[PDB]
Design a protein around this ligand. Structure first.
Ligand code: HEM
Ligand code: 224
Ligand code: CL
Length: 214
């Protein structure tokens, strides 16, 4: 049939266009982004990734994910912790927010990681394949807007020190992604979960936009 890496690209091209042009994003690309909303986004990602990576570890030995286990090159938890200490200070752990939409996302992550590990790959895709495609353009909007150092403090999340060429790594990852055992049943559910992952995102951005509009 059709390769998984391309079945997912197709299955999410529509919803990607709705997320890329959601209100919050539309605002971010306008350079209009306060420290307040940015910290909000970063804190939320910290929870999302802490959940995703905690589940990837639980299933790293599992053949439904194993081929994609790249902690040293992809994982964001460590980088996000550095960003949390930078934005929220030393005791950020007891100061960061945990909004409802974020909880919904984390809840789903644990469900998949605990009971539908074969779908776990739909979330690594949505999250990591995305981070290797445009954390370059938005990175620059951020630095400009808030006056952040080229050195990287406060933007650890956006850097990949162990990956030289993200485009090339992304290609490798796609190929590896296509070596996983796939059956109609699984290929169907996996792409379906990727659309859900996008919606959880779109929902999260609508919720943050709401909060910021005091
Ligand atoms: C600030 C709004 C966004 C912009 C401007 C943006 C832009 C892009 C661009 C330019 C690409 C690469 C295009 C290509 O394939 O040649 C891309 C890929 C991707 N984006 Fe976004 N994106 C945005 C938001 C999102 C969101 C909210 C998600 C979901 C967390 C997301 C998930 C992805 C994924 C999964 C890919 C890789 C698809 C693939 O190549 O198979 N993006 N994005
Ligand atoms: Cl404000 C904000 C919101 C979301 C992120 C996260 C990662 C990311 C990764 N990504 C970039 C292009 N396509 C996906 O998702 C959307 C924009 O960047 C950073 C900053
Ligand atoms: Cl939608």
């Amino acid at each position: 049939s059709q390769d998984l890496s391309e079945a997912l690209k197709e299955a999410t091209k529509e919803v990607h266009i709705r997320a890329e042009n959601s209100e919050f994003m539309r605002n971010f690309q306008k350079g209009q982004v306060s420290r307040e909303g940015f910290k909000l986004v970063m804190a939320s990602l910290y929870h999302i990734y802490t959940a995703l990576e905690e589940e990837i570890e639980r299933n790293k030995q599992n053949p439904v994910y194993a081929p994609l286990y790249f902690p040293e090159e992809l994982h964001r938890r460590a980088a996000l912790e550095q960003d949390m200490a930078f934005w929220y200070g030393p005791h950020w752990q007891e100061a960061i927010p945990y909004t409802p939409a974020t909880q919904h996302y984390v809840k789903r992550l644990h469900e998949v990681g605990g009971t539908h590990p074969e779908l776990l790959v739909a979330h690594a895709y949505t999250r990591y394949l995305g981070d290797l495609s445009g954390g370059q353009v938005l990175k620059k909007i951020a630095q400009k807007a808030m006056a952040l150092p080229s050195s990287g403090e406060g933007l650890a999340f956006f850097t990949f020190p162990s990956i030289d060429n993200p485009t090339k790594f992304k290609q490798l990852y796609r190929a590896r992604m296509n070596t996983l055992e796939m059956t109609p049943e699984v290929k169907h559910r996996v792409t379906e979960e990727a659309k859900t992952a996008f919606l959880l995102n779109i929902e999260l951005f609508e919720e943050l936009q709401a909060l910021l509009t005091e």
